[PDB]
Amino acid sequence: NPWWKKAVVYQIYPKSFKDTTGNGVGDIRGIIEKLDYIKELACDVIWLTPIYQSPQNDNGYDISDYYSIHEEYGTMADFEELLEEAHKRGIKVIMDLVVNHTSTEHRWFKEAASGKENLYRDFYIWKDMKPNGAPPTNWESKFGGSAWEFHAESGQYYLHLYDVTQADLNWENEAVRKKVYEMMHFWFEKGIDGFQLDVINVISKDQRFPDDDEGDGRRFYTDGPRVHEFLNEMNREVFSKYDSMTVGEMSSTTIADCIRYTNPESRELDMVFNFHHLKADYPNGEKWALADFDFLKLKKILSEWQTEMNKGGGWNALFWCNHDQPRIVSRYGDDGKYRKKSAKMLATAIHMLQGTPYIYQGEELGMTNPKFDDISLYRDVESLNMYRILKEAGKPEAEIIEILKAKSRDNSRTPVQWNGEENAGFTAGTPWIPVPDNYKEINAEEALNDPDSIFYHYKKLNELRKEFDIITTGDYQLILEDDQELYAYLRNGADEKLLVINNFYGKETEFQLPDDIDIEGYDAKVLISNDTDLPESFKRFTVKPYQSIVYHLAK
């Protein structure tokens, strides 16, 4: 019974969490000051997105030194004090591990690029131009364009699956794996409690490097032939030595692989995120296109991941939000009239699944997309570039702004709204990204003083996971699969059940318990609800707009 199984993790994006220095950028001291808040929310893990030394060409995911902290966030002494104060409050700390690639400003790369005969050359993935002048493969970077960048001085291309200054490490090379493990030991011995492993499932490449005539080439590196071998080796060398938690962030992976990644017998990872439920509103897999989410598909994806991982002995990391996705109230809830109720409903819908839940900073306040209506308010380079291109293509300003409001990666990066003071109390200076005007109504101080707040609903869900074992051990059973508005399911235990009923829309609808649900001899009590208007009988009743109810059934 490992500590991570009943944990709730709070995801912090430090640059937007809390500025204590006045430069408008969040810092580690700001995190320390907020530990009591995190503890009050009843999270027992904190996860920091990358804070390592980095040129910042790619939001910190381009690391030039894994052993030091980007100066703006604070000092190593600050970090060590964060670990000490977190641990004092019973809070564990996990870091972001980004080892598929490094910055091309990393010393290994600078050495490696300098000549084909340099000691570090094989730390990266180098290939010759094809005789026909083509790049070594037709693979595409996830940033667009070719995944190979030519280096004139040495006469070869290096592989970058991501941005140009993010060079893929050569995991075929034992020296590299060894270096990475040494670095992980450094952080564990400092006392951190685990890692999120960034796109870890793309580290094994097909060493034949064939062309892809059926896609962009991801089938030659996604969940590749040695990934499970590398993860298990990583587990033997590192993770097995500490009381650790590891969560792998898998890029377009499959359920069968994730079962293998997370089954305790594999000795690979503890849990994984997948992103399938967060592609439910992409029409034709077009990531920037507007569309309504496909509810039935959403329910099918969630259910499949619950039942198959449960069956296979895998473990899911449960989440709606991160620094790259729209805030969920705005995306799948109603950030208008039903902001509070729909935010509570969304939290319940996911937290009553089997898995380890993750809360993204500000999600517990029901923070919304900021709805910035002028390009001068945006920051992310992909947003600025998309605006520039759509403008040149003649799209009216208002239509471009509507796209950015739905899709900009800036949207979940606005500063956490602490209070009703200037810039919501995030900073005394000028924030690196603006705070939208809702902050006067949406902020921690307000939520903390409202017993009916989204915050306290999350706190209660968090404590429930510690109080009721069935949340962890019960199976999952989808019901009302084809219902156009309700997401309802059971968690089945030993003479004990949870019945979870969520209205995903703002209309009234009928719930009726299916005949094949056997609850003879079971007594019902409300475990948690977002509405005091409770049905006389849960077996058939009219569900209110965005109503969410969980019943504890015991025999």
Ligand SMILES: O=[N+]([O-])c1ccc(O[C@H]2O[C@H](CO)[C@@H](O)[C@H](O)[C@H]2O)cc1
């Ligand atoms: O510049 N960036 O910060 C950046 C870099 C890459 C990126 O795409 C992808 O690869 C990342 C690995 O780095 C993962 O973190 C992320 O989950 C995934 O979507 C998104 C943003």
Ligand SMILES: [Mg+2]
């Ligand atoms: Mg600061």
